[PDB]
Protein backbone atom coordinates (compact mmCIF):
# COMPACT_ATOMS: atom_id res chain seq x y z
CA UNK A 1 0.00 0.00 0.00
CA UNK A 2 2.81 2.38 0.97
CA UNK A 3 5.30 3.90 -1.42
CA UNK A 4 8.81 2.64 -0.97
CA UNK A 5 11.41 5.42 -0.84
CA UNK A 6 15.15 5.55 -1.18
CA UNK A 7 17.32 7.56 1.13
CA UNK A 8 18.58 9.97 -1.56
CA UNK A 9 15.03 11.05 -2.30
CA UNK A 10 14.37 11.89 1.32
CA UNK A 11 17.75 13.57 1.73
CA UNK A 12 16.84 15.97 -0.97
CA UNK A 13 13.21 16.59 -0.10
CA UNK A 14 14.40 17.61 3.34
CA UNK A 15 17.17 19.85 2.01
CA UNK A 16 19.76 17.35 3.21
CA UNK A 17 18.01 16.84 6.49
CA UNK A 18 18.54 20.48 7.52
CA UNK A 19 18.13 19.69 11.16
CA UNK A 20 17.45 23.23 12.28
CA UNK A 21 14.38 25.42 12.98
CA UNK A 22 12.00 26.63 10.39
CA UNK A 23 12.27 30.19 11.61
CA UNK A 24 15.91 30.30 10.65
CA UNK A 25 15.69 28.44 7.37
CA UNK A 26 15.84 24.81 8.35
CA UNK A 27 13.53 21.89 8.09
CA UNK A 28 13.37 20.52 11.62
CA UNK A 29 9.77 20.66 12.77
CA UNK A 30 10.51 18.50 15.75
CA UNK A 31 11.86 15.41 17.45
CA UNK A 32 9.98 12.74 19.32
CA UNK A 33 9.40 9.03 19.22
CA UNK A 34 12.97 7.85 18.68
CA UNK A 35 13.50 10.22 15.86
CA UNK A 36 13.27 13.59 14.26
CA UNK A 37 10.69 14.98 11.93
CA UNK A 38 11.27 17.34 9.08
CA UNK A 39 9.03 18.82 6.48
CA UNK A 40 9.34 17.06 3.08
CA UNK A 41 7.60 17.00 -0.36
CA UNK A 42 6.08 14.45 -2.81
CA UNK A 43 4.63 16.20 -5.96
CA UNK A 44 1.28 17.60 -4.55
CA UNK A 45 1.42 16.21 -0.96
CA UNK A 46 3.54 17.71 1.87
CA UNK A 47 5.03 14.83 3.91
CA UNK A 48 6.36 14.37 7.44
CA UNK A 49 9.73 12.58 7.38
CA UNK A 50 10.47 10.56 10.54
CA UNK A 51 14.27 10.00 10.46
CA UNK A 52 15.33 7.51 13.18
CA UNK A 53 14.95 1.07 16.86
CA UNK A 54 14.35 -1.41 13.92
CA UNK A 55 11.53 -3.30 15.78
CA UNK A 56 9.78 0.08 16.40
CA UNK A 57 10.12 0.84 12.62
CA UNK A 58 8.78 -2.71 11.73
CA UNK A 59 5.80 -2.45 14.17
CA UNK A 60 4.77 1.11 13.14
CA UNK A 61 4.24 -0.11 9.46
CA UNK A 62 2.55 -3.35 10.73
CA UNK A 63 0.01 -1.44 12.93
CA UNK A 64 -0.48 1.41 10.33
CA UNK A 65 -1.45 -1.08 7.55
CA UNK A 66 -4.41 -2.66 9.46
CA UNK A 67 -5.38 0.55 11.28
CA UNK A 68 -6.73 3.28 8.95
CA UNK A 69 -9.19 5.76 10.53
CA UNK A 70 -9.81 9.54 10.24
CA UNK A 71 -8.51 9.96 13.82
CA UNK A 72 -5.25 8.08 13.21
CA UNK A 73 -2.33 9.66 11.33
CA UNK A 74 -1.88 8.23 7.83
CA UNK A 75 1.42 6.61 6.79
CA UNK A 76 2.25 7.27 3.11
CA UNK A 77 5.72 5.71 2.95
CA UNK A 78 9.17 4.95 4.32
CA UNK A 79 12.71 4.02 3.36
CA UNK A 80 14.85 1.19 4.66
CA UNK A 81 18.27 1.83 3.15
CA UNK A 82 20.61 0.43 5.77
CA UNK A 83 20.86 1.54 9.42
CA UNK A 84 19.41 4.94 8.56
CA UNK A 85 15.64 4.48 8.59
CA UNK A 86 12.73 6.63 7.54
CA UNK A 87 8.96 6.76 7.96
CA UNK A 88 6.76 9.06 5.81
CA UNK A 89 3.20 10.34 6.61
CA UNK A 90 0.68 13.00 5.53
CA UNK A 91 2.15 16.16 7.11
CA UNK A 92 -0.11 17.49 9.90
CA UNK A 93 -0.21 21.30 9.35
CA UNK A 94 -1.06 22.14 12.95
CA UNK A 95 1.52 19.83 14.59
CA UNK A 96 0.86 18.32 18.03
CA UNK A 97 -1.83 19.13 20.62
CA UNK A 98 1.11 19.63 23.13
CA UNK A 99 2.59 22.41 20.98
CA UNK A 100 -0.81 24.08 20.28
CA UNK A 101 -1.73 23.99 23.99
CA UNK A 102 1.60 25.75 24.76
CA UNK A 103 1.19 28.13 21.70
CA UNK A 104 4.66 27.10 20.53
CA UNK A 105 6.04 29.44 17.81
CA UNK A 106 3.30 32.02 18.46
CA UNK A 107 0.27 30.04 17.26
CA UNK A 108 -3.03 31.38 18.72
CA UNK A 109 -4.54 29.59 21.77
CA UNK A 110 -7.08 26.84 20.96
CA UNK A 111 -10.67 27.86 21.73
CA UNK A 112 -12.86 25.69 24.03
CA UNK A 113 -15.02 24.78 20.96
CA UNK A 114 -11.86 23.52 19.18
CA UNK A 115 -10.71 21.69 22.39
CA UNK A 116 -14.02 19.76 22.58
CA UNK A 117 -13.71 18.57 18.95
CA UNK A 118 -10.06 17.49 19.56
CA UNK A 119 -11.03 15.52 22.72
CA UNK A 120 -13.88 13.74 20.84
CA UNK A 121 -11.66 13.02 17.83
CA UNK A 122 -8.83 11.66 20.00
CA UNK A 123 -11.36 9.42 21.90
CA UNK A 124 -12.67 8.14 18.51
CA UNK A 125 -9.10 7.27 17.43
CA UNK A 126 -8.44 5.37 20.71
CA UNK A 127 -11.82 3.61 20.27
CA UNK A 128 -10.80 2.38 16.80
CA UNK A 129 -7.52 0.95 18.17
CA UNK A 130 -9.30 -0.74 21.15
CA UNK A 131 -12.01 -2.19 18.79
CA UNK A 132 -9.10 -3.62 16.72
CA UNK A 133 -7.55 -5.12 19.92
CA UNK A 134 -4.56 -2.73 20.01
CA UNK A 135 -3.15 -1.00 23.11
CA UNK A 136 -1.34 2.24 22.17
CA UNK A 137 0.91 2.40 25.34
CA UNK A 138 2.02 6.01 24.76
CA UNK A 139 -1.14 8.17 24.73
CA UNK A 140 0.03 11.75 25.30
CA UNK A 141 -0.62 15.24 23.86
CA UNK A 142 2.70 15.02 21.88
CA UNK A 143 1.07 11.95 20.15
CA UNK A 144 -2.16 13.76 19.20
CA UNK A 145 -1.58 15.57 15.92
CA UNK A 146 -3.77 18.19 14.27
CA UNK A 147 -4.63 18.39 10.60
CA UNK A 148 -5.65 21.37 8.39
CA UNK A 149 -9.08 21.39 10.18
CA UNK A 150 -7.62 20.78 13.71
CA UNK A 151 -8.96 17.20 13.57
CA UNK A 152 -7.18 15.05 16.16
CA UNK A 153 -5.04 12.23 14.83
CA UNK A 154 -3.47 9.64 17.18
CA UNK A 155 0.17 8.98 16.17
CA UNK A 156 3.16 6.79 17.15
CA UNK A 157 2.26 3.06 17.17
CA UNK A 158 5.90 2.00 17.74
CA UNK A 159 5.17 0.80 21.31
CA UNK A 160 1.61 -0.44 20.42
CA UNK A 161 0.62 -4.03 21.38
CA UNK A 162 -2.06 -6.28 19.83
CA UNK A 163 -3.87 -8.88 31.66
CA UNK A 164 -0.33 -9.47 30.15
CA UNK A 165 2.95 -8.40 31.89
CA UNK A 166 6.40 -7.17 30.62
CA UNK A 167 10.02 -6.74 31.90
CA UNK A 168 10.64 -3.62 29.69
CA UNK A 169 8.38 -0.84 31.13
CA UNK A 170 7.90 1.79 28.39
CA UNK A 171 5.91 5.03 28.16
CA UNK A 172 5.84 8.64 29.37
CA UNK A 173 5.83 8.49 33.23
CA UNK A 174 3.76 11.74 33.70
CA UNK A 175 0.91 9.97 31.74
CA UNK A 176 1.32 6.38 32.97
CA UNK A 177 -1.28 4.44 34.92
CA UNK A 178 -0.01 2.95 38.26
CA UNK A 179 -0.41 -0.63 36.87
CA UNK A 180 1.51 0.30 33.66
CA UNK A 181 4.42 1.57 35.81
CA UNK A 182 4.32 -1.94 37.41
CA UNK A 183 4.66 -3.73 34.05
CA UNK A 184 1.00 -4.49 33.22
CA UNK A 185 -0.06 -4.13 29.52
CA UNK A 186 -3.80 -3.27 29.35
CA UNK A 187 -6.04 -0.94 27.23
CA UNK A 188 -7.26 0.38 30.65
CA UNK A 189 -3.79 2.07 30.97
CA UNK A 190 -4.52 4.02 27.69
CA UNK A 191 -7.72 5.35 29.39
CA UNK A 192 -5.71 6.71 32.36
CA UNK A 193 -3.22 8.41 29.96
CA UNK A 194 -6.18 9.90 28.02
CA UNK A 195 -7.39 11.33 31.38
CA UNK A 196 -4.08 13.22 31.70
CA UNK A 197 -4.60 14.55 28.08
CA UNK A 198 -8.08 15.75 29.06
CA UNK A 199 -6.58 17.66 32.04
CA UNK A 200 -4.04 19.23 29.62
CA UNK A 201 -6.95 20.31 27.34
CA UNK A 202 -8.91 21.93 30.24
CA UNK A 203 -5.92 23.65 31.92
CA UNK A 204 -3.41 24.15 29.05
CA UNK A 205 -0.79 22.97 31.56
CA UNK A 206 2.05 20.49 30.78
CA UNK A 207 1.62 16.96 32.39
CA UNK A 208 4.75 17.62 34.46
CA UNK A 209 6.46 20.76 35.65
CA UNK A 210 9.32 20.99 38.15
CA UNK A 211 8.35 24.62 38.93
CA UNK A 212 4.77 23.89 39.84
CA UNK A 213 2.74 22.64 42.77
CA UNK A 214 1.80 19.97 42.13
CA UNK A 215 4.50 18.90 39.76
CA UNK A 216 2.24 16.34 38.16
CA UNK A 217 -0.89 17.52 36.48
CA UNK A 218 -2.76 14.27 37.43
CA UNK A 219 -2.39 15.41 41.09
CA UNK A 220 -4.80 18.41 40.59
CA UNK A 221 -7.52 15.76 40.72
CA UNK A 222 -6.75 15.30 44.37
CA UNK A 223 -6.66 18.98 45.14
CA UNK A 224 -10.16 19.29 43.69
CA UNK A 225 -11.51 16.24 45.62
CA UNK A 226 -10.00 17.63 48.82
CA UNK A 227 -11.46 21.02 48.01
CA UNK A 228 -8.16 22.82 48.15
CA UNK A 229 -9.03 24.02 44.69
CA UNK A 230 -11.70 24.02 42.05
CA UNK A 231 -11.66 23.05 38.44
CA UNK A 232 -12.51 26.66 37.73
CA UNK A 233 -9.24 27.62 39.31
CA UNK A 234 -7.43 25.53 36.75
CA UNK A 235 -9.42 26.30 33.54
CA UNK A 236 -6.95 27.65 30.90
CA UNK A 237 -7.11 31.47 31.05
CA UNK A 238 -6.12 31.60 27.34
CA UNK A 239 -9.79 30.95 26.29
CA UNK A 240 -12.80 33.28 26.19
CA UNK A 241 -15.44 30.64 25.25
CA UNK A 242 -15.28 27.99 28.06
CA UNK A 243 -18.50 27.48 29.98
CA UNK A 244 -18.56 25.84 33.44
CA UNK A 245 -21.06 23.11 32.37
CA UNK A 246 -19.06 21.51 29.53
CA UNK A 247 -15.74 22.11 31.37
CA UNK A 248 -17.07 20.23 34.43
CA UNK A 249 -18.47 17.55 32.09
CA UNK A 250 -14.98 17.04 30.50
CA UNK A 251 -13.33 17.13 33.97
CA UNK A 252 -15.81 14.39 35.12
CA UNK A 253 -14.65 12.17 32.19
CA UNK A 254 -10.95 12.95 33.05
CA UNK A 255 -11.62 12.20 36.75
CA UNK A 256 -13.17 8.80 35.88
CA UNK A 257 -10.23 7.96 33.51
CA UNK A 258 -7.78 8.71 36.33
CA UNK A 259 -9.18 6.20 38.80
CA UNK A 260 -6.34 4.41 40.54
CA UNK A 261 -8.02 1.04 40.08
CA UNK A 262 -8.00 -0.01 36.42
CA UNK A 263 -11.36 -1.94 36.58
CA UNK A 264 -13.14 1.16 37.98
CA UNK A 265 -12.15 3.25 34.91
CA UNK A 266 -14.69 3.59 32.05
CA UNK A 267 -13.90 1.76 28.79
CA UNK A 268 -13.19 3.91 25.66
CA UNK A 269 -16.82 3.47 24.41
CA UNK A 270 -18.19 5.03 27.64
CA UNK A 271 -15.57 7.85 27.34
CA UNK A 272 -16.59 8.50 23.68
CA UNK A 273 -20.32 8.46 24.70
CA UNK A 274 -19.71 10.84 27.65
CA UNK A 275 -17.69 13.29 25.45
CA UNK A 276 -20.48 13.27 22.83
CA UNK A 277 -23.16 14.02 25.56
CA UNK A 278 -20.97 17.03 26.62
CA UNK A 279 -21.73 18.87 23.32
C1 LIG B 1 3.72 23.15 12.93
N1 LIG B 1 3.99 21.73 12.79
C2 LIG B 1 3.42 20.93 11.86
C3 LIG B 1 3.95 19.68 12.08
N2 LIG B 1 3.59 18.58 11.38
C4 LIG B 1 3.77 17.26 11.79
N3 LIG B 1 4.45 17.03 12.92
C5 LIG B 1 4.67 15.76 13.32
N4 LIG B 1 5.39 15.48 14.50
C6 LIG B 1 5.88 16.60 15.33
C7 LIG B 1 4.83 17.30 16.12
C8 LIG B 1 7.25 16.44 15.98
C9 LIG B 1 7.07 17.44 14.87
C10 LIG B 1 4.18 14.68 12.59
N5 LIG B 1 4.37 13.41 13.00
C11 LIG B 1 3.83 12.41 12.26
C12 LIG B 1 4.04 11.02 12.74
C13 LIG B 1 5.41 10.79 13.22
N6 LIG B 1 6.49 10.61 13.60
C14 LIG B 1 3.09 12.63 11.12
C15 LIG B 1 2.91 13.95 10.71
C16 LIG B 1 3.45 15.01 11.43
N7 LIG B 1 3.27 16.28 11.01
C17 LIG B 1 4.82 19.83 13.18
N8 LIG B 1 4.85 21.09 13.61
Provide structural commentary.
The strands form three sheets. The protein has a six-stranded mixed β-sheet with strand order 1-5-6-4-3-2, with helices on both faces. The protein has two domains: 1-91, no CATH class; 92-279, no CATH class. The protein is globular and about 60 Å long. The longest helix is centred in the middle third of the chain and has 20 residues, at 112-131. The protein has ten helices and ten strands. The protein is an alpha+beta fold and 279 residues long. Helix 4 runs antiparallel to helix 6 (187-203), helix 4 packs antiparallel against helix 10 (268-277) and helix 6 runs antiparallel to helix 9. A hairpin with a 6-residue loop joins strand 5 (75-79) and strand 6 (86-90). 36% of the residues lie in helices and 15% in strands. Bound molecules: the ligand Cn1cc(Nc2nc(NC3(C)CC3)c3nc(CC#N)ccc3n2)cn1. The ligand Cn1cc(Nc2nc(NC3(C)CC3)c3nc(CC#N)ccc3n2)cn1 is lined by residues 29-30, 32-33, 37, 48, 50, 73, 89, 91-93, 95-96, 145, 155.
Amino acid sequence: RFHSFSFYELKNVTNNFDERPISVGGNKMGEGGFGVVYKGYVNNTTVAVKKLLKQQFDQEIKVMAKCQHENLVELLGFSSDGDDLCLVYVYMPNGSLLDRLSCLDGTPPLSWHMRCKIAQGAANGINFLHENHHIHRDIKSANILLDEAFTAKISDFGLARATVMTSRIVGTTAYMAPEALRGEITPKSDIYSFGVVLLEIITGLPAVDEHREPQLLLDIKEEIEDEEKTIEDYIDKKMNDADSTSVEAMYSVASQCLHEKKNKRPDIKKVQQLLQEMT
